[PDB]
């Protein structure tokens, strides 16, 4: 059971996580736009760009994040952007769309000029995560934990990041005991998906160097393209 300060932290996180969702114009573009590599690619670029905005807004509200050294703030954002994008994309793919829109988004992703080297681990990861049957609290906390990863490159004050991450891990741990007492290794299973997640750093770097369609200036900045 959650201590009342753990409850206050969860509630604060969830309010920030629920605050920004997927705009209707993009969602309708999934259903209604022409299907072609260039057009499919553009939709996805537009989803990724909206995600970056949402990610920065959520990150800025994480307890303690604004007290960190300004260079550390940037390193955490840059270091977590891809992983957090994949985590949100899994949530959207499994939970936040009608059955129709998921099938069509999958099709669009599979025909957007992306290599098969990258597609296969992607859908494998989405099916893996989908089989965990995560709640929205679990997605919110895992997103926060991935952002506040103290082992990113060029983080000066790693201990300071550990302190911000640890309370979120403790809460996530209690939610895995509560919502699945059936499975006492469920917490570790979740943290296993973080390992899968980290592989998308290599895959995403590869897909990026293997270009040149234009990205947005925000995407180029946060991906270092």
């Amino acid at each position: 059971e959650l201590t009342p300060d753990q409850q206050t932290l969860l509630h604060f996180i969830m309010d920030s996580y629920n605050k920004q969702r997927m705009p209707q114009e993009i969602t309708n573009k999934i259903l209604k736009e022409a299907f072609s590599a260039e057009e499919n690619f553009l939709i996805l670029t537009e989803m990724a760009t909206n995600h970056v905005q949402v990610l920065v807004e959520f990150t800025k509200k994480l307890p303690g994040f604004q007290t960190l050294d300004h260079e550390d703030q940037i390193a955490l954002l840059k270091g977590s952007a891809v992983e957090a994008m994949f985590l949100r994309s899994a949530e959207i793919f499994n939970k936040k769309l009608p059955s129709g829109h998921s099938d069509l988004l999958e099709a669009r992703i599979r025909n957007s000029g992306i290599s098969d080297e990258y597609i296969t681990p992607m859908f494998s990861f989405y099916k893996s995560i989908g089989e965990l049957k995560m709640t929205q609290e679990e997605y919110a906390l895992l997103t926060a934990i991935v952002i506040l990863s103290p082992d990113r490159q060029y983080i000066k004050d790693r201990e300071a990041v550990e302190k911000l991450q640890e309370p979120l891990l403790d809460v996530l741990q209690k939610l895995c005991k509560i919502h699945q007492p059936e499975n006492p290794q469920h917490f570790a299973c979740l943290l296993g998906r973080l390992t899968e997640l980290r592989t998308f750093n290599h895959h995403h770097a590869e897909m990026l160097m293997s270009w040149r369609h234009k990205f947005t200036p925000l995407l180029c900045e946060i991906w270092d393209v």
């Binding site: 920065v56 800025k60 940037i74 840059k78 900045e221």
Partner: peptide, 12 residues
């Protein structure tokens, strides 16, 4: 090249 992310982080 901080410009966009920095703007997004610092803005109110």
């Amino acid at each position: 090249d901080h410009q966009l992310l920095r703007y997004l982080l610092d803005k109110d």
